[PDB]
């Protein structure tokens, strides 16, 4: 069912700072020539929208897109089925979705001059990076190579154009400033649950160590593992014996211990191999990355935590990609999120 | 006043093309290093969202943000009151809002290399332009100089930071490709009404000349005037006797004539001077720009059209800025839009 009843909805900007050009602004002089002269720029702010059901129950959910994405991935699937935003408003949660700084409706810090440069200061790099359709295909485990699908895939096949159109570049904004914006959002809304994805997995972990209002984390296929400083376990290279996964993020142990105080669940889809796969770099990357996360959750649990790893195939769901929340079975994926929230009372007032 | 009941909601991507890097993609090689080799890139696609009421009436509305903006400006005001999206779903219209190519969730075409460059080809310029807080303050007629308000202003004071944070740069995407994406949307949705703003004013006029499904246009303070080719009337410079307004866009008369076949209203706010104001460049710019538009509407009416200029002060609304649909009296502004829709039969099935 697609019907949704909202007590209220809206959007707002939060976070960011200002930077300034030289000189003074003269309102009698041509303004459209557009210079940095006397200019104030708001940079690195974050876009937030919310939908609140009638009679909400439990804590609000904050959905945080993965790398190169926007809040669109929580609104609808590529083939136009309801996303988690609709599903969880229907589940009587207030739902926030964000476009983080540097992505979508979040700020891209650029000015009058080469991209990212304000006179002689480099706010973000002029040289960009961006994934390709082919890179994203294998990153997301649609299949082992572009154009190919794993058997019993849950990808909405035929909607590849819609799917890859949602992805884009990110400028070199400091991860510190992205975490800061979401910490400010968590302060603004009160106790809440973070639901993260891929690149925003490690960032949401960082937010929780700065914000007691984060009462729970569910992370869909986080990309970067996190460990106490100096206590990164041995992690093997990839099957090509030269490549490695993302360098794990290290935080002071006093902050790492805060992750032991809240329920945390990492969710993984299908077709992550058990054994080395030299022929398919990103399948092997996911094998080792998932292994690193299992060690990260173990370290949290050794400090008193409540951290768990959910492989969707163990729960009877086969064929999920790196985006289980937009796959064809995303209602069943949502049902498992509801189960986690209910188990820990995060769906009660 | 905030409750909304939706039969369905969602978002999707539409329009755009692809460009390709050199070489071929090999899934056995490191994918994350990140390069253009073997790369297909989707570029210039547009983001679209929709909210459909239960029991819709009349034609769907397409809200099209002004320059440097996004669909946020139709969602909420900077002080958090409902935007036109909520107001017109409550008025039982299906409401589409877009982030055009190059803005917000629309695509920004950049790759692996200097911003906008795909190997040797410049897709968009590496040098950007962007307005400042100061330039936007006087552009939007909050007051005559940055930090100063007109006594009558309808701006939601105290929420300046929120307001200016919604603005950003646009890469040098061809206007043809922006018009193309919206023509494809209008083809997809069927008969509809365009509601435009500032920079999207001239673009919406162009869409209507390509798309018979556009059945009406309301433009809030369009920034660029439009005339039949070779029939641009005499337009004076600004009071400084050096500056000019935006060069009017010229189209073939066979296309311009299609503007005479639908109702068209341009809406202007307050504090546009009647006499030359050499001390306040953007106040004077709005005086001459509004004059040019009056001549543009006259040309449409001389081709049998029904094109009107609504000055909000003549309807009893004083103090409106360049964003009347987010001002403190935006409910009264919406009432005037509903009047236009009802008079022209655009709110009946
Ligand atoms: C349109 O709907 C909402 C919802 C919401 O919360 C669920 N907050 C706003 N705005 C809002 O709070 N602005 S604000 O006041 O300027 C502000 C502060 C502050 O000063 O207390 C801190 N952050 N910010 C953004 N709009």
Numbering used by the authors:
A (entry chain A), B (entry chain B): 12 to 360
Original authors' sentences:
SulE, an esterase, which detoxifies a variety of sulfonylurea herbicides through de-esterification, provides an attractive approach to remove environmental sulfonylurea herbicides and develop herbicide-tolerant crops. SulE catalyzes the de-esterification of a variety of sulfonylurea herbicides, such as MM, BM, SM, TM, TrM, EM, and CE, to the corresponding herbicidal-inactive parent acid. The structures show that SulE is a dimer with a lid loop in a domain-swapped β-hairpin covering the active site from the opposing monomer. SulE shows a similar catalytic triad consisting of Ser209, His333, and Glu232 at its active site.
Previously, we obtained a mutant P44R through directed evolution, which showed 1.7- to 3.2- fold improvement in catalytic efficiencies towards MM, SM, CE, TrM, and EM, but showed 0.18- and 0.28-fold decrease in catalytic efficiencies towards BM and TM, respectively. Structural analysis showed that Pro44 is located in the lid loop. To understand the molecular basis for the altered activity by Pro44 mutation, the crystal structures of apo-P44R, the double mutant P44R/S209A in complex with CA, and the triple mutant P44R/S209A/H333A in complex with MM, CE, and TM were determined in the range of 1.32–1.78 Å. Structural comparison analysis shows that the P44R mutation leads to lid loop shift, which in turn modulates substrate binding and enzyme activity. Structural analysis indicated that the substitution of Pro44 with arginine altered the flexibility of the lid loop, and further allowed the relocation of the heterocycle ring of MM and CE.
